[model samples]
Target: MEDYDVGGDMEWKRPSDPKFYITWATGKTFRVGDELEFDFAAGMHDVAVVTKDAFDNCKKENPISHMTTPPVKIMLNTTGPQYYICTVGDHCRVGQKLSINVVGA
Candidate 1:
């Protein structure tokens, strides 16, 4: 949640080689015990857990989860594709969202 993409793609406001990040995340296997540890600057960005509907439209409406501070931790309690996007300026539309498939029931 601490990434800044100045003059980045307006349609895909991702930070720091987001395309590569997607490439790295593709076809990955995640266990149920997995979790996320995030750290970043203030006002730069925030993490928002969104539903598939919101994930596509880039809407954070009543986000299931949101973290604004550094060193945020989240447990992967459910199984399936988890989507995370930044709540910063048009970040989600510009491809700032992350969708991961976790292996669990």
Candidate 2:
């Protein structure tokens, strides 16, 4: 998002707001105890931690977990790469998706 911090090589996108931006988590290393802060407009966007297959298809049918609140905090409790995306329309397709690699605590 902001300055293309840790996301992929694409533009950042959000729901109901084209002026939104954020820093990708790619520059930082995630650990089990780390927290992922999610900030966004209420009722407009949602957070979904999904699988590789679900992420690839922009599917939120069976998310590992989900959130729909602003100023939320997601704790990392497991190892491996985490997939995240917005379930509102084409948000994920435009850049509202994230992939984070988490390591053991």
Candidate 3:
């Protein structure tokens, strides 16, 4: 399991380092009927478990923001594309969101 950093704007830093980030090529993936676990850091953060459809809809209504905190774990019983984002304020809009592919069981 790998750990990813989220939050913090790159003012004097580089654009390559944004306020939020996630990795899809590696890390964790869930499958239908499989139990998934997540661990997050500690601080202030908003955790939202959403689907691709939900995300698109929510993005139009409300956006995500930066966040920090302990590890967060979640379990799934369904398949499809799942995602998590920081709903603090403008984190998601900046890019504080990640997508997970739920394969077949």
Overall local distance difference test of candidate 2 = 0.68
TM-score of each: 0.75, 0.75, 0.52
Off-target runs (Cα >4 Å) in candidate 1 are 1-13, 16-18
The Cα error of candidate 3 at residue 71, in Å, is: 3.1
lDDT string, candidate 2, 5-100, tens digits: 222333223634422333545357778887777666687778888998887788977798888876556788789988888898778766677777
Query: Which residue pairs collide, candidate 2?
Result: 1-22, 2-22, 6-24, 6-26
* Per-residue error (Å), model 1, residue 67: 1.0
Ranking 2 against 3 by TM-score, winner: 2
Say which candidate scores most in lDDT: 2
Residue-level lDDT of model 3, residues 24-82, one tens digit each, is 32555456655433344344445666657656444533333222444454555566777
Ranking by lDDT: 2, 1, 3
Each prediction's RMSD to truth: 6.5, 5.9, 6.7
Tens digit of lDDT per residue, candidate 1, span 1-105? 223222223322355554644654566555577666555567676789888888878897789898887656677767788877887887676667777777773
Cα-based lDDT for every prediction: 0.66, 0.68, 0.48
Candidate 1: worst-modelled 10 consecutive residues by lDDT: 1-10
Q: List the residue pairs that clash in candidate 1.
A: 11-94, 12-94, 13-94
